[PDB]
């Protein structure tokens, strides 16, 4: 998760890596 700091700090916004939107989906869905 540390390596994911700078990627969203100065605006890399990686999209073909292991940080796609579903990577946020499958942990936000557990919130409800």
């Amino acid at each position: 998760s540390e390596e994911r700091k700078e990627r969203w700090e100065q605006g890399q916004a990686d999209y073909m890596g292991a940080d796609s939107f579903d990577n946020i989906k499958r942990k936000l869905d557990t919130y409800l």
Binding site: R4, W8, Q10, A13, I24, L28
Partner: protein
């Protein structure tokens, strides 16, 4: 209930008037429990909100805790209709804990924000302040009542998921107005509405630097208990883009200014149209060879967008109408106004010259008529009749003759009432030259381009936007990418026919509530399942059909279109908001 929006202190979009109009009905529904949340702006506290230094009668401890803990908040009354209870939250009051907040924001909804985008950081801190305020309130509210949270804008909605991350027993409603990435899709020279089934959303958000904005927009949409969207087509594009079907659609309503008499909106059209004629006469001195009682006024308004507003399709439709009118041998002539605010400098010398010539002709007529009045008064006093053997005077004919000599002109009338800064790259003028509309005598379609908002301070056209709209005969709005559409709704409220498309939110909304939308004057098009040529041909057919009716038929059409104002009023649109709030409450806590 809590309304969260970024447009409470600044008028950057149309959400301001929507919220201002909805405040009355929301307050009438919710009594004194209606609170609204908005950012604090230095420019929006002078004549925009009455600050209340006194504590809220039902809330004293949370404000004291918030003030003592460092952040600065204000309570007061919004300077709008009804009774609003507004809270303003400063953006710099808690600007000293952005690092800590984003450190503890990594595990909540996993959103990252660039450091050089001040607006995104301001929205994030606003969301943090809002969720902190909700937490403090529910901690200090003894958990007796139930709180429902409504979010109207995506910047203000970033905190919504934060509440969902804090297990707060509240109903979560997410309302969107338009897709940000969709706006940039339409400028990519790629078909958008016919390819709605296949979007490579991740990358197109990636290389276009709008990745994170869509990221927390979709996060808020997914996390919300209920999701609402402005119109049906916007709901469809959200479902095919955000991968979440909205529970219900929420069209925007507008307050209607009723009159004592039903027909008064006709009278406002009668005189305002006259103000247009005095303009067009001035713009057509030396070429007034057509009867002005058989003239139609078409217009298209809004922001200067070429493809997204349908200026081009209107232009070639008018060209086809002109070509058709020169083979039918008809005397009807139409005038099309383009209220497209662009960047301009100074005025047009020919237009002002025409206005001055019209005024000079009026002065000459006034002098001659005063002389005639004096002579007629004398003859009536002596007890006789005017035989017109002395009105000639052998002198007034000289001045009238030289006036007519001055009125003579050789060059063609101009197409613009201003002076363009650039002419080799202006789409409107290039298209007009290409299609061949030069306001010639043999033509039947006239084009007038006025790249400036209409105001009473202008030298020419001394009318505002509302009166000019009320004066026209039919507004043509062939929108292509329009989320909801305010101008056609305004025209419908004013009581004039309009032309719209199912692509626009207003057209789709009207097409699904009233059967046969042709007798009421809301001419609908089909730009979704038809090609450009089919759409322009249908528009030309509609224009010819409008030109075909008589004056009585036009009066019938306008009278019937006037009655549809009740459909767009908030009194009818509040039902959808009530349903959405009730569904959210049921989903959160039975």
């Amino acid at each position: 209930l809590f309304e969260v929006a970024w447009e409470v202190a600044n008028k950057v979009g149309g959400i301001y008037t929507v919220l201002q109009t909805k405040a009355k009905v929301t307050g009438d529904e919710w009594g004194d429990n209606y609170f609204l949340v908005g950012p604090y702006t230095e420019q929006g506290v002078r004549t925009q909100v009455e600050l209340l230094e006194a504590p809220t009668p039902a809330l004293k401890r949370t404000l004291d805790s918030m003030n003592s803990k460092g952040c600065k908040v204000y309570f007061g009354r919004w300077l709008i209709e009804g009774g609003p209870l507004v809270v303003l939250l400063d953006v710099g009051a808690s600007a000293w804990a952005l690092e800590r907040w984003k450190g503890e924001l990594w595990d909540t909804c996993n959103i990252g924000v660039p450091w050089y985008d001040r607006e995104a950081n301001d929205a994030v801190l606003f969301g943090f302040l809002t969720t902190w305020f909700l937490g403090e309130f529910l901690a200090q509210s003894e958990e007796k009542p139930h709180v429902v949270a409504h979010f109207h804008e995506w910047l203000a909605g970033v905190g919504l998921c934060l509440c969902r991350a804090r297990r707060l027993p509240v109903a979560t409603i997410f309302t969107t107005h338009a897709t940000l990435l969709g706006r940039y899709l339409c400028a990519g020279a790629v078909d958008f509405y016919n390819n709605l089934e296949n979007f490579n959303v991740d990358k197109e958000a990636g290389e276009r630097q709008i990745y994170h904005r869509y990221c927390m927009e979709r996060a808020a949409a997914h996390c919300a208990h209920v999701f609402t969207t402005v119109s049906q087509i916007t709901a469809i594009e959200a479902q095919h883009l955000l991968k979440r079907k909205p529970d219900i659609v929420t069209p925007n309503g507008l307050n209607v200014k009723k009159f004592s008499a039903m027909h008064e909106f006709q009278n406002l059209h009668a005189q305002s149209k006259a103000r247009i004629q005095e303009f067009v006469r001035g713009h057509f001195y030396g070429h007034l060879d057509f009867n002005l009682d058989k003239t139609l006024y078409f217009f298209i308004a809004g922001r200067y967008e070429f493809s997204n507003k349908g200026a081009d399709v209107f232009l070639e439709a008018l060209a086809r109408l002109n070509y058709l009118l020169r083979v039918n041998g008809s005397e009807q002539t139409v005038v099309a106004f383009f209220i497209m605010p662009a960047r301009t400098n100074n005025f047009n010398v020919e237009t002002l010259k025409g206005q001055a010539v019209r005024k000079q002709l009026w002065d000459t007529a006034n002098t001659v008529k005063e002389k005639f009045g004096r002579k007629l008064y004398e003859s009536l006093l002596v007890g006789s009749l005017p035989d017109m053997n002395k009105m000639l005077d052998k002198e007034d004919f000289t001045m009238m003759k030289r006036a007519i000599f001055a009125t003579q002109r050789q060059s063609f009338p101009p197409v613009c009432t201003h002076n363009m800064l650039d002419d080799s790259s202006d789409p409107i003028l290039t298209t007009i030259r290409r299609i061949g509309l030069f306001n010639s005598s043999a033509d039947r379609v006239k084009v007038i381009f006025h790249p400036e908002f209409l105001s009473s301070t202008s030298p020419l056209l001394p009318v505002d936007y509302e009166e000019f709209v009320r004066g026209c005969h039919l507004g043509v709005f062939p929108s292509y990418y329009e989320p909801w559409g305010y101008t056609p709704a305004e025209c419908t409220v004013m009581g004039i026919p309009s032309i719209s498309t199912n692509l626009s939110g207003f057209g789709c909304f009207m097409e699904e509530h009233i059967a046969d939308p042709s007798a009421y004057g809301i001419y609908i098009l089909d730009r979704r399942f038809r090609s450009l040529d089919d759409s322009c041909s249908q528009l030309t057919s509609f224009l010819y059909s409008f030109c075909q009716q008589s004056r009585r038929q036009r009066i019938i059409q306008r009278n019937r279109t006037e009655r549809l104002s009740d459909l767009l009023d908030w009194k009818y649109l509040g039902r959808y908001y009530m349903s959405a709030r009730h569904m959210a409450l049921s989903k959160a806590f039975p």
